[PDB]
Amino acid sequence: GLPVCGETCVGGTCNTPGCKCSWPVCTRN
């Protein structure tokens, strides 16, 4: 639920395990 991945999923990518794409930002849970 938290954007603590340090990743944006603009292209639909989130590498950090637990990160979901809450476009355009990755949220870990």
From Swiss-Prot:
Leaves and stems. Lower in roots. Kalata-B1 is a cyclic peptide which occurs in three forms: with unmodified Trp-23, with Trp-23 oxidized to form oxindolylalanine and with Trp-23 oxidized to form N-formylkynurenine. Oxidation is enhanced by exposure to sunlight. It comes from the Eukaryota. Disulfide bonds join C5-C19, C9-C21, C14-C26. There is a cross-link at G1-N29 (Cyclopeptide (Gly-Asn)). The presence of a 'disulfide through disulfide knot' structurally defines this protein as a knottin. Probably participates in a plant defense mechanism. Has antibiotic activity. Has a diuretic effect. Has a uterotonic effect in humans. Active against the Gram-positive S.aureus with a minimum inhibition concentration of approximately 0.2 microM. Relatively ineffective against Gram-negative bacteria such as E.coli and P.aeruginosa. Inhibitory effect on the growth and development of larvae from H.punctigera. The unmodified form has hemolytic activity, the oxidized form lacks hemolytic activity. If the protein is linearized, hemolytic activity is lost. Belongs to the cyclotide family. Moebius subfamily. This is Kalata-B1. It comes from Oldenlandia affinis. The gene is OAK1.
